[PDB]
Design a protein around this ligand. Structure first.
Ligand SMILES: [Ca+2]
Ligand SMILES: [Ca+2]
Ligand SMILES: [Ca+2]
Ligand SMILES: [Ca+2]
Ligand SMILES: [Ca+2]
Ligand SMILES: [Ca+2]
Ligand SMILES: [Ca+2]
Ligand SMILES: [Ca+2]
Lengths: 222, 196, 196, 222, 196, 196
């Protein structure tokens, strides 16, 4: 048994998201949840994509809840890939983080491989990461395509809640204004596929724990 | 290298009318009060150890009106337009323009008895987004903020929103004053003339 | 004076065909990967504390072919011409181009579960013939080796021989990538422009 | 569970050969090792191949070590097939031994099936035999395509170390001269494939234990 | 996690004239010197654990002229225009353009006994704005600051201002050089080509 | 077994001009100095236990010029062409051509208190390529290196590069001298006449 592996025809992973956990300590309110974050497709050429890791863009629910608080702090942020194609599908997915919004987005898996939190994997695998989303007890997550933010090494603790609109304007003046507003961005690259046209590969789920502080009417929060 | 000052000084004079008038003060040395404004300028950066705003009355018991105070932390967020929104902010306290005398003990450091009637609120220094901020003149701040308000986040810790209303005159009636009592740490000296 | 770096980066991209294709990589900073190549250049000499090559797949389960890896230590010895000779080398491991996922844990440092299926092999740093080697550019190495390969012995610790075959196409099919995970000690700095 | 089987998409077997074990008793020196011995490919028509079981041809390492001794004796010789293609690959492999070099090589799986140590199997299976090569603890080797020499029934115990060259010359005079020099030959047949052109199927590894005696400078050994 | 480097390198070449000439240098990897600029670019953020500027002379004891150094922390503050104004900054240090050799021991970190005359100053690494700063290139920084100077406080921890005067010639005479000795922690690797 | 010697001797005489002049010296017995070259030849191999180069001035305090020293370890690397590039090497040490007297105590090993100004650098004897190096003559080394420079790494542990510039004359002025203080272990005796 040691050294032996059997490639399945297809992997299956039944995602079932549980109720968000919210609770107020003294000053701080904490949310814990999972949300589908991105859809994935492969091509024969490399395609790099990025996602800012801030409440507004991390998830559709989080976006609206976090808006009722002035600032926040990430306790944990994890991105897990769950496949939706057969083992016959060609393609690989690659993830990593960048921390200075002014830096250039990677243009190759070689550059990409050097980033913090890098992970690669066949576009048809990763069901082992299900326990992170479903909240089950994790078994062998050895083959999961999932990565996490190094929250302790982030630029500062408390960041202001920002809307994509206001952020986009700021960044338009100078991208360096972003440094003060967002902690990092997830970079995603997909290649090694076989069609010139995208082929649905899988999807990415985000699991986070956030601390929110100093309340404000939502309407005022920009 | 850290030089510490503790002081209470007049920060704002208050008048009340029959309409809501919302105003705000940046919680930075330059705007907190003129005395501090002048001493803190001789240092490059500071850290707030404690900041408390206390309203002390000066009007007759027959003076109608109420004061409401609260904090905002992202200069880009819109300033409350109604006293309703204001009541949602952190540190909200609302009193009546002739009361608040018990707060005097915060101003002259004498032992405070029961301060449940003092119209006073404090800044959550630990939840601020950084500990050492740069000394800024309102002029320079204004310019920065003119390019994009988000540039303010790196420069100032918070903003104190004040609202006065429910008065009885269309014309301002002297209600009281807001004094600020702080403990501040100042570091890395500079000739003040260069400090912007 | 010893400055230590730990890192895992892409070292080689792998394609499989229906014929044996033997290739080799010198186990020195310059050739191990481009990132290291660039940082290690700012130092004159180094010592490998740990070097492990791990293959990670990118193809479909239906991809036929196998990868074989092993080490050579006297650059003057002939590079294996058959996969047979290759299986005699130290550190020999042979896997199937679509497997090896469990090796991912070596690349992102997460705790490894069962790695008996990871196509990974490591360098016997203690049996190397010297501990501190000089940083060499492949260009300069080439020249030296051109005079006499034996000059390589004093310059490089070992060589990684890779063989790919058993594929199903006469034309290369993308199989996977070899990533290198190392711990290195760098000493005696130098401006990189002078490092040959 | 009894009676149920699931065909995988592909089998995986991670071969990792350990250091040769050599040790000298009193007179005899013993080696234990594994070497990749042959590469395999299938076609739609039958193709029979043979391998002499003597030090020189059993393995590239063994060849050079055994040459320093005058005679040897096989304590154990096993050939194990490890696949390198998917379960969709057509083809079957067949092995067996012949002991009189003058006999004709089999020309059909029917003749072949009668040989000593016969074994058949799908060209895409056999990973179960990995434990023999890797040296792990063997689990269910029920489905391994691996066979072994019946060393006790061999013609004699001590055989002389011979080089393929000298052997080839001898045999050229008369094949019966081989009987005195080599104990047996492995016959390998492959057919049931789908291309008229060979398709890589897998490879064969040889695991042996040999006893070597009476030293001689290698240069003199023919 | 973190990768720590301690190193020394030439940071600037100096010349004295007969009129004040204040200049400054950002205290960031890219500008501290060529070597650091080079290796630091392979990481995304960094933290200074120690930064020390030491001036070392190369002129005869008869060379007229004096050197002055100090730190500023709000890139928006005006840069000093005179020795008086400059003497107020943190880490102020002045001396004869031909003096300063005792600071050699800081450079090739030996036993420093005679350091009372070393024209060497140190950065107050703990009172800096934040811990982790992003690696910026002169180019990128320049542009940002061109929009508004305050955009700099989020990117650079401080700047060293240097003033030279009291020379004898109206045309620059070679005085000495400023070397930088730092210990820096770097994190979050990146291919250098992407780092702006 | 081993025979240990600790000694000091003149290693090189120095002169300053108004243009950079980088030169180097192999750190081997034959070239360290005349005396050692002589006694060391009676042994086959040796090991440095300690090597220190100390520059000592002989010019007036009014002599313009500066001296720079550092070590390189891959004889194949390009030798520095400027002070910046040189300041990066290990053991870098710079100073006024008329400074450096405090290093005298290293020469006639006395109590060294004032050594902060000593223009003296030391070889990192433990991070050297190997322990026992063979005694080579300039002649023999030269020829080997003429075939390929890399043949040198197996024979010499390092080279000291020296750069002098900032002088006032275009024609060389006497500045000072470099002395070498070593402790060396020698083994495997041989008649000196056979030693190449
Ligand atoms: Ca906001
Ligand atoms: Ca900030
Ligand atoms: Ca300022
Ligand atoms: Ca050697
Ligand atoms: Ca080199
Ligand atoms: Ca023989
Ligand atoms: Ca950057
Ligand atoms: Ca000799």
């Amino acid at each position: 048994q040691a050294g032996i592996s059997m490639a399945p025809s297809a992997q299956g992973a039944m995602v079932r998201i549980r109720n968000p956990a919210v609770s107020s300590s003294r000053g701080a309110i904490t949310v814990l949840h999972c949300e589908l974050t991105a859809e994935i497709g492969v091509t024969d050429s490399i395609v790099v994509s990025s996602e800012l890791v801030m409440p507004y863009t991390v998830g559709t629910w989080l976006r609206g809840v976090a808006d009722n608080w002035s600032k926040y702090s990430w306790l944990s942020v994890r991105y897990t890939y769950i496949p939706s194609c057969p083992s016959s599908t060609a393609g690989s997915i690659h993830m990593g983080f960048q921390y200075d919004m002014a830096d250039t987005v990677p243009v190759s898996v070689n550059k990409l491989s050097n980033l913090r939190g890098y992970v690669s994997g066949q576009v048809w695998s990763g069901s082992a990461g299900l326990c992170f989303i479903n909240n089950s007890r994790c078994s062998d997550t050895s083959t999961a395509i999932s990565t996490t933010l190094d929250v302790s090494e982030l630029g500062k603790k408390w960041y202001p809640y920002k809307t994509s609109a206001d952020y986009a304007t700021a960044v338009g003046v100078d991208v360096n204004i972003a440094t003060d507003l967002v902690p990092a961005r997830l970079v995603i690259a997909l290649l090694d596929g076989s069609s010139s046209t995208a082929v649905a590969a899988g999807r990415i789920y985000d699991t986070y724990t956030i601390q929110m502080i100093e309340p404000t009417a939502s309407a005022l929060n920009l």
